[PDB]
């Protein structure tokens, strides 16, 4: 990904590189399940 190459070869081969990586990842997941339940009773939505 990130390589900065300085090369001499003709006179001498002298290689000087600054190799840097910056990675950015953002993941956002927003899920909303709605369940209709009796009162004081259990009801269950399961999505899997």
């Amino acid at each position: 990904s990130g390589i900065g190459i300085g090369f001499i070869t003709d006179n001498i081969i002298l290689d000087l590189q600054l190799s840097a990586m910056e990675k950015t990842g953002n993941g956002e997941i927003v899920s909303q399940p709605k369940v209709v339940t009796s009162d004081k009773e259990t009801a269950k939505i399961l999505k899997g």
């Binding site: 000087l16 600054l18 990842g25 993941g27 209709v36 009162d39």
Partner: protein
């Protein structure tokens, strides 16, 4: 140690990964309809 070469000889890796998770909830009584039902 060298001021001009330390950056060229100091390898820095800094990573900040921050994930926040939050759960809301709202109950809408269906009795408003269930009493009428």
């Amino acid at each position: 140690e060298l001021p001009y070469l330390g950056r060229l000889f100091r390898r820095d890796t800094v990573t900040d990964r921050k994930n926040e998770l939050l759960v809301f909830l709202t109950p809408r009584i269906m009795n408003n309809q269930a009493i009428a039902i």
